[PDB]
Amino acid sequence: QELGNANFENFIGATEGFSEIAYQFTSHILTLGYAVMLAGLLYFILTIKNVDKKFQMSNILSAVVMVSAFLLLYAQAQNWTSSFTFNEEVGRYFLDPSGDLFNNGYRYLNWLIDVPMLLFQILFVVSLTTSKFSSVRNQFWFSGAMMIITGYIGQFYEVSNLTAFLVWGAISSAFFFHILWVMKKVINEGKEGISPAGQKILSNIWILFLISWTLYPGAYLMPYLTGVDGFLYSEDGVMARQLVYTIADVSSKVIYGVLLGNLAITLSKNKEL
Amino acid sequence: QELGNANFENFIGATEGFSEIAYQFTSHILTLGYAVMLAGLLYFILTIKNVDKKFQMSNILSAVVMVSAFLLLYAQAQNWTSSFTFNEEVGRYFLDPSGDLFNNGYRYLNWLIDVPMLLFQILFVVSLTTSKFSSVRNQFWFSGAMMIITGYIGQFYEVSNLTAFLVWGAISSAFFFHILWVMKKVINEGKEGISPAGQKILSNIWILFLISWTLYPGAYLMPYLTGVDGFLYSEDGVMARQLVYTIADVSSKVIYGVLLGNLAITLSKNKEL
Amino acid sequence: QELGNANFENFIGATEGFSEIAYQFTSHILTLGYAVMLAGLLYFILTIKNVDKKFQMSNILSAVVMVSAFLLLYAQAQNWTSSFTFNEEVGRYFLDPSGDLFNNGYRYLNWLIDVPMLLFQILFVVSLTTSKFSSVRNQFWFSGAMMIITGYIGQFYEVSNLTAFLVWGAISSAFFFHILWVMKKVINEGKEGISPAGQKILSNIWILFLISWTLYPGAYLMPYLTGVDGFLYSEDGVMARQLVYTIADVSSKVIYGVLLGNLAITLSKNKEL
Amino acid sequence: QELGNANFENFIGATEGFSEIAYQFTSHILTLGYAVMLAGLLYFILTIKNVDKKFQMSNILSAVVMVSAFLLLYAQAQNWTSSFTFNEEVGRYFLDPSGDLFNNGYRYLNWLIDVPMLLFQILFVVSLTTSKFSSVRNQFWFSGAMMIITGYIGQFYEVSNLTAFLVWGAISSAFFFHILWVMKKVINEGKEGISPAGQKILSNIWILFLISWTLYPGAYLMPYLTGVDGFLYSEDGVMARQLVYTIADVSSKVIYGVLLGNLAITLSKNKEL
Amino acid sequence: QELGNANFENFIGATEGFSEIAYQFTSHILTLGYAVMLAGLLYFILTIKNVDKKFQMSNILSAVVMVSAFLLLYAQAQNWTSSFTFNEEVGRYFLDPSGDLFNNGYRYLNWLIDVPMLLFQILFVVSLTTSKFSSVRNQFWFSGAMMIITGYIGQFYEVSNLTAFLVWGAISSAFFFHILWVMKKVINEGKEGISPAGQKILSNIWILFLISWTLYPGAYLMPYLTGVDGFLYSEDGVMARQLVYTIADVSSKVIYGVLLGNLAITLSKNKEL
Numbered sequence A, B, C, D, E: 001q002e003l004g005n006a007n008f009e010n011f012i013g014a015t016e017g018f019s020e021i022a023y024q025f026t027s028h029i030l031t032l033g034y035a036v037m038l039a040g041l042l043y044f045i046l047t048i049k050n051v052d053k054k055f056q057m058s059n060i061l062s063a064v065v066m067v068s069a070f071l072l073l074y075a076q077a078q079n080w081t082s083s084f085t086f087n088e089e090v091g092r093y094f095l096d097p098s099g100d101l102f103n104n105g106y107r108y109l110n111w112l113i114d115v116p117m118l119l120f121q122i123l124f125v126v127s128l129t130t131s132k133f134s135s136v137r138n139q140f141w142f143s144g145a146m147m148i149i150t151g152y153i154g155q156f157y158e159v160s161n162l163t164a165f166l167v168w169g170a171i172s173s174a175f176f177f178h179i180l181w182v183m184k185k186v187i188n189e190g191k192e193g194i195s196p197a198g199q200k201i202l203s204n205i206w207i208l209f210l211i212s213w214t215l216y217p218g219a220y221l222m223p224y225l226t227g228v229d230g231f232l233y234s235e236d237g238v239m240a241r242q243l244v245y246t247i248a249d250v251s252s253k254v255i256y257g258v259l260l261g262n263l264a265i266t267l268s269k270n271k272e273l
C-alpha cells in the first residue's frame, strides 16, 4: 500500500492500527480542543467592556483567533474519525482511505491567521519604547509566514523523506528564534513605566509564550523524539502529538488572551482587577 | 467479537442488542441534554445585566460551561445513533462498529472545562473570609484535573479489567472528597456577612452540589451497582447511566448557575428579586 | 417484520409505504415547524426592551423555549427523511431501518423544557392574589413532569399494547386536567385589578392555551380517532399527527409568547401598545 | 419508473438527466439564494437603530423572513445535490431516488411565514387613511394562507394531473389578485401626507411588489409556458424555474425590506438618507 | 470518461489523479479561506463603533461580504473533498463522480453579492466631488453583473470549447476595465479635501484593488498560462488556481475592508489611528 508524502498517523493506522484507547483519546482531545476555542470565543466577546476602549482590539483579535482555532479543530476532529475505522476481526481502528489520509497540515495554513494575530494583539496592550510599532509588526508577520510555510512543506515528508523533513524544520526554526527574539524585546519594553502588577503579568506571558510556542516544533518532531523504531513511532506517539497540540493551542491562544486581558485591566484607568 | 478496553454499552449492544425503548430513550435523553445546555447558554447571556458588574463574570463562566456541555452532548447524541443500528431479523439495535465504539470518555476530557469553571465561578459571587482566593482556585483546579484524569483512565477498563476500574475509581474518589471539603469551606465563608435570603441560597447550592456531583461516580459504577450479572448489567443499566448523566449535567451546570445568579441578585445593591 | 414497541408511522411505512404527497408533506410541515421556532427566537430577543425590566424574563423564557423547539423539530425533520426511503419499483417511501425507526418520543422529553418554562413564564407577567408564586410553580412543574413521563411511556405501546397506551394516556390526562385547573386560577387572579386591555389579552391567552395544549393528547390518539382500520390508521393519520403537532407547537410556544409580550407592554408604565 | 404526484424536475432527471451546466447552475443559484438571505439577516439586524423606534418592527420582521428563507433555501440546495447523481457512462446527472424526489413544496409551506410577515411589515412604516390596520392585516393573512395552501396542493399534480394543477392554480390566483388589490390601497394611503421622496420609494415598492410576487405563479407554470413538449419542458425549464424563484426571493424579501428601511429613514424625525 | 462542459480539475482528477500534497493543499487553502471570512465577520461587527455613525454602513457591507464568502468557501471546501477519493492501489486521489464534478462556478454567482457590495461600500467612506453617488453605484452594479455572468458562462467551456472560453473571457474583461476606470475616478475624488494620511490609505486601496481583482481573471486563465500541455495543465495548476483565489479573496474582501475601516477612523472627528 503506497501512502506517498503522508503523515506517520496513516502508516501506524495502515500497519498496526489503533487500540480503542488510542483512537478514542485522539478523538476526545481534539473535541476538548474545539470546545475550549468556542467557549473562549464567548469569553473574549463578553469581557470586551472590562477594559478601556484602546485595549478592546486585543479582545477582538483573541476572538478572531478563537474563530480560526474552533473551525480548524472541529474539522480535524471529524477528519480523525473519518480516516480510521474499526476492524471487527482484530478489534483495532485501521486507515480508511475513503475518509482521506489524516494530515496535520490543516493546522499549519490556519496558523497564517493565528500566529500573525497572536503576535499583533500584544501591541494593542503594551507600549513600545525603543522599538517601532510598524517594524515589530512587519518582523512578526514576515518571520511568522516563513516559519509556517517552511514547516508546512517539511511535515509532508516526515515519513517519505526524513532529510527534507529535518532541513525544512531547521529553516523554520531560524524564523521561530527571530520571533522569540522580537517578542522578548516587546515584553521588556512593555514592562517599562507600568505598575509592578502589570510587570508580573508580562513576566508570566513571556514564560507561557516561550513554552506554549516551543510545543509546536515538539509536535513536529514527536514521532522521532525516541529515535528510529522508538516508543513514540507508534499509536502512543500519535496520541502524544495531538495531546501536545491541544495543550499548546489552549496555552498559546486562550490563556495568552486571558493574561493580556488581565494586563489591559491593570493598565485601564477605571478598572482595578 | 474482540472489543478490548471498551465501555459496557458496546458489550450489551454486541450480545443482546437494544430494544426500541432502550435505544430511543438513550437518544432522547442525550437530545434533551444538549437542548438544555443551548437554552441555558441563551439564559446566562440574556441575564448578564440583572446583577452588579462584579458578579457578571459568574454569568460568563456559566455561558462558557453551556458551550462545552452543548458541544459535547450534541456530539455524544450523534455518537449513540452512529454506534447502534437496527437488525430487521430480530428487531433490536446492535453494535455497528463502522460508527466507532461508544465511549463515555468524551464527557471526561470536556470536564477539564466544566469542573474548573464551575468551581471557579462561585468565587466571583461569595466573599471568602479566612481562605485565600488563589489557594482555593488552585486546590479546585489541581484536584479537579486529577479526579477527571484518574477516572478517565479507569472507565476504559470498566469491562476489560474490573480491578484497574475500581483502583483508578478509588484514587479519583480521594480527589473528589478533597473538592467537597474545599467547597464546604467556600459555602460557609460565603454565608458570613450576607442576608438570610443569600444564606438560604448557599445552603441550597451546597445540597445541589453534593447530590449532583455524586451522580457522576454513580454513573461510573452504574453497570455493577446490582453486582455481577445484576439487573443493571443490561440495556436498563445503559439507559440508567445516560439518565443519571443528564440529571447530573442539568443540576451541576444549569440549576447551579441559576442559583448563583439569584445569589448575585440578592448581593447586588441596585437589583432585587 | 418485527418492529416491537414502535410508533405506528413505522408500521404504515413498512406495510403500505408513503405516497410522494404523504412523505413530502410530513417533511415540509416539520421544516416549517423548525423555521418558525428559529424566527421566533430572533423575534423574542429583538423585542426584549419593548417591556419594563420586570417583564423581560418572559421574553427570555420564550427564547429558551424557541431554542428547545428549534433543535427538536430540526432533529425530527432529519429523522423523518432518514427513516423512509423511495422504492423505485412501487414509487412509494418505505421504512429504512438503517435510519432508525421514527419515534415521536423525541418531542416528549424536550417538553421537560417547554412545559415547565411555558407555565412558569406567565408568573413573570401577571400578579397572583390568593395563590403563592412558589406553590403554583411547584404544581405546574410536578404535574407537567408526571404528564410528560406517563405519556412518554404510553406512546411506545401505541401499536404493541393498546391497553398500556390507553392506561398511561389516562394517567397522563389526569395530570393535564390539574395543569388546566391551576392555569385557569392563574388567569383569573391575573385579571384582578388590571386594565381592560390586559383582561382581554388574558381571555385570549386562556382560549389559546386550552385549545393548543389539548392538540397534544389529540396527536397521541390520532391513529385511533377513526377507530380500528379507520381512515386515520394510514399515511393520512401520519400526516395529520405531524400537522397537529406543528399547529400546537406554533400556537402553544410562539403565539402564546407574543400575547404575553403584548400583555407585558399594556402593564408596562413606560411602554405603550 | 413510477414517480406518481412528483414535480417535473424528477421526470426530466429520470429520462434525459441533467448536463453539467444545468445541474451545476441549479446548485449555484440556490447557493446564492441562501447566501443572500443570511447576509440580509445580518444587514436588517445591524441597521435596526437607523430608524425611529416605531419603525424598528419592520427591521425585525425583515430579519424573521431572512431566517425562514435562509433555512428553506439552504435545505433545498442540499435536496437538489442529493436528488441527482452523475452517471459516468453518459456524463449526465440522473434522478437518485435514495436522495428522495425533489419537491418545490418546501418553499410553499415556508411562505406561511414569508407572505404574512412581508404583507404585515409595511403596516409598521406607512400610515393608513381610510383603511383599519387590523382589517388590512386580517385580509392579507387570510388570502395569503389560502393562496399558499391551494397552490401547494396544485404543484403536486403539475405532471400527474394537469387539470388539478390548473384549477388549484386558478383558485390560488384569485386570492393573489385580492392581495394585489389590498396592497395597492395600502401604498396609495401610505403616499398621503408624506414627503415626495417617501412617495417615490412607495411607487418603487409597488412596482417591485407587483413584478417580484408575479414571478412565483410564473415559476409554478414554468414547465408549460412553451406549451406541451415545449423548450421549457426540459433541463432549461428546470434551470429557469429556480432562477425565477431566486430573482423573486431576493426582490420580494431583501430589496423590499431595504426600500421599506429607506422609507422608514425618510419618515424618521432624527434620520436622513 | 465523458465529462462534457466541466472544469479542468475534473480532467486532471480523472486521468492522472492528485498526489497527497496536491489534494491536501487544495483542501487546506479552501479551509484557510472560509476561516479568514468567519474571523473577518466577527472583526467587522466588533469594530462598528470605532468609526462615526455615517461610516458604519461600510463595516455592515464588509460583514455582508464576509457572510457570502464564508458560506461559499465552506461549501467549496466540502465539494473538493467530496469530488476526489483516494485509490489505495496507486496512492492518488481520483475523480469520484458520486460527489458531483468540482466547479468554480459556485464562486461566480456568489460574486453577485461580493462585487456589487465591495464597489458600493467605498461610497460610504469617501466623498465624491464631480461624480453622482447614484451614477457611480449604477455603473459599478451594471458592469459588475455583466462581468460576472459572461465569465460564468465562459468557465464552463475552459476544456470543452477554448474559443467560447476566450471570447466570453474577453467580453467579461471589457466590463472589468470599465469597473477599474470608475473605481480610479472614485479614488481620485475621494482624495480631494481629506488629510494626507487619508490620501495614503486610498493610494494603498487602489493598488490592493487593482492587484487583488486582476487575480480573478488570472485564476480563470490559470490552466493555460503555460500554454498547451504546459506545467500548469496539471495538479500544480489546480493548486495554483485555488491558491490565487484564496489570496484574491482575503485581499479583495478582508484587507480592503480593514483599509476602508482605517480610512473611516482618520475621517472620523472623534477617533484617530
Ligand SMILES: CCCCCCCC/C=C\CCCCCCCC(=O)OC[C@H](O)CO
Pocket (backbone or CB within 6 Å): C134, C135, C136, C138, C139, C142, C143, C171, C174, C175, C178
Ligand atoms: C394510581 C393510578 C392513578 C393515578 C391518577 C393520578 C391522579 C392525579 C390527579 C391530580 C394530580 C394532583 C397532584 C398533586 C400536585 C402536587 C403539587 C406539588 O407537589 O407542590 C406542592 C406545593 O408546593 C404546595 O405547597
Ligand SMILES: CCCCCCCC/C=C\CCCCCCCC(=O)OC[C@H](O)CO
Pocket (backbone or CB within 6 Å): E132, E134, E135, E136, E138, E139, E142, E143, E171, E174, E175, E178
Ligand atoms: C461587448 C463588449 C462590452 C463593451 C464594454 C462595456 C463597458 C461600458 C459599459 C457600460 C457603460 C455605461 C453603462 C451604464 C449603465 C447604467 C448606469 C448609469 O450610468 O446610470 C446612472 C443614472 O444616470 C443615475 O445617475
Ligand SMILES: CCCCCCCC/C=C\CCCCCCCC(=O)OC[C@H](O)CO
Pocket (backbone or CB within 6 Å): E225, E226, E227, E228, E230, E240, E243, E244, E247
Ligand atoms: C500573487 C500570488 C501568485 C502565486 C501563485 C503562483 C502561480 C503562478 C501563476 C502564474 C505564473 C505563470 C506565468 C506564465 C508565463 C509563462 C508563459 C509561457 O510559458 O508560454 C506559453 C506557451 O509556451 C505557449 O504555448
Ligand SMILES: *C/C=C(C)/C=C/C=C(C)/C=C/C1=C(C)CCCC1(C)C
Pocket (backbone or CB within 6 Å): A111, A114, A115, A118, A147, A148, A150, A151, A152, A154, A169, A170, A172, A173, A176, A213, A214, A216, A217, A220, A248, A249, A252, A253
Ligand atoms: C495557535 C497557533 C500557534 C501559536 C502556532 C505556532 C506555531 C509554531 C511556533 C511553529 C513552529 C515550527 C517550528 C519551529 C519548526 C517545525 C515547523 C513548525 C512550523 C511546527
Ligand SMILES: *C/C=C(C)/C=C/C=C(C)/C=C/C1=C(C)CCCC1(C)C
Pocket (backbone or CB within 6 Å): B111, B114, B115, B118, B147, B148, B150, B151, B152, B154, B169, B170, B172, B173, B176, B213, B214, B216, B217, B220, B248, B249, B252, B253
Ligand atoms: C458537568 C460536569 C461535572 C460537574 C463533572 C463532575 C465529575 C465528577 C465529580 C467525577 C467524579 C469521578 C469520581 C469521583 C470517581 C469515578 C471517576 C469520576 C471522574 C467520574
Ligand SMILES: *C/C=C(C)/C=C/C=C(C)/C=C/C1=C(C)CCCC1(C)C
Pocket (backbone or CB within 6 Å): C111, C114, C115, C118, C147, C148, C150, C151, C152, C154, C169, C172, C173, C176, C213, C214, C216, C217, C220, C248, C249, C252, C253
Ligand atoms: C410546546 C410543548 C407543549 C405545550 C407540550 C404539551 C404537552 C401535552 C399537553 C401533553 C399531553 C398528553 C396528554 C394529556 C395525554 C397523552 C400524553 C400527552 C403527554 C401527549
Ligand SMILES: *C/C=C(C)/C=C/C=C(C)/C=C/C1=C(C)CCCC1(C)C
Pocket (backbone or CB within 6 Å): D111, D114, D115, D118, D147, D148, D150, D151, D152, D154, D169, D170, D172, D173, D176, D213, D214, D216, D217, D220, D248, D249, D252, D253
Ligand atoms: C418570499 C415569498 C413570497 C413573496 C411568496 C409569494 C408567493 C406567491 C405570490 C404565490 C402565488 C401562487 C399563485 C398566484 C398561483 C400558483 C400557486 C402560487 C402559490 C405559487
Ligand SMILES: *C/C=C(C)/C=C/C=C(C)/C=C/C1=C(C)CCCC1(C)C
Pocket (backbone or CB within 6 Å): E111, E114, E115, E118, E147, E148, E150, E151, E152, E154, E169, E170, E172, E173, E176, E213, E214, E216, E217, E220, E248, E249, E252, E253
Ligand atoms: C471577492 C470577490 C471578487 C472581488 C470578485 C471579482 C471578480 C472578477 C474581477 C472577475 C473577473 C473576470 C474577468 C475580468 C474575466 C474572466 C471572467 C471573470 C469573471 C473571472
Ligand SMILES: CCCCCCCCO[C@@H]1O[C@H](CO)[C@@H](O)[C@H](O)[C@H]1O
Pocket (backbone or CB within 6 Å): A162, A221, A224, A225, A227, A228, A229, A230, A233
Ligand atoms: C531531531 C530528531 C530527529 C531524529 C531522527 C531519527 C531517525 C529516525 O529513523 C527513522 O525511524 C523510522 C521509524 O522508527 C523508520 O521507519 C525509518 O526507516 C528511519 O529512517
Ligand SMILES: CCCCCCCCO[C@@H]1O[C@H](CO)[C@@H](O)[C@H](O)[C@H]1O
Pocket (backbone or CB within 6 Å): B162, B221, B224, B225, B227, B228, B229, B230, B233
Ligand atoms: C463497588 C461496586 C463494584 C461491584 C463489583 C461487582 C463485580 C461484578 O463482576 C463482574 O460482573 C460482570 C457483569 O455481570 C461479569 O460479566 C464479570 O464476569 C464479573 O467479573
Ligand SMILES: CCCCCCCCO[C@@H]1O[C@H](CO)[C@@H](O)[C@H](O)[C@H]1O
Pocket (backbone or CB within 6 Å): C162, C221, C224, C225, C227, C228, C229, C230, C233
Ligand atoms: C381514541 C381512543 C380509543 C381508540 C380505540 C380504537 C381501537 C383500535 O383497534 C386497533 O386498530 C388497529 C388499526 O385499525 C388494528 O390494527 C388493531 O388490531 C386494533 O386493536
Ligand SMILES: CCCCCCCCO[C@@H]1O[C@H](CO)[C@@H](O)[C@H](O)[C@H]1O
Pocket (backbone or CB within 6 Å): D162, D221, D224, D225, D227, D228, D229, D230, D233
Ligand atoms: C397556462 C399554461 C397551461 C398550459 C398547459 C398545456 C401543456 C400541457 O401539455 C403537457 O405537456 C407535457 C410535456 O410537454 C406532456 O408530457 C403532457 O403529456 C402534456 O399534457
Ligand SMILES: CCCCCCCCO[C@@H]1O[C@H](CO)[C@@H](O)[C@H](O)[C@H]1O
Pocket (backbone or CB within 6 Å): E162, E221, E224, E225, E227, E228, E229, E230, E233
Ligand atoms: C491567453 C492564454 C490562452 C492560451 C491558449 C493556449 C491553448 C491551449 O491549448 C490546449 O491545451 C490543453 C492542455 O495542454 C490541451 O488539452 C488542448 O488540447 C489544447 O487545445
Ligand code: NA
Pocket (backbone or CB within 6 Å): A080, A081, A082, A083, A084, A085, A086, B098, B099, B100
Ligand atoms: Na472512525
Ligand code: NA
Pocket (backbone or CB within 6 Å): A098, A099, A100, E081, E082, E085
Ligand atoms: Na471521502
Ligand code: NA
Pocket (backbone or CB within 6 Å): B080, B081, B082, B083, B084, B085, B086, C098, C099, C100
Ligand atoms: Na442508529
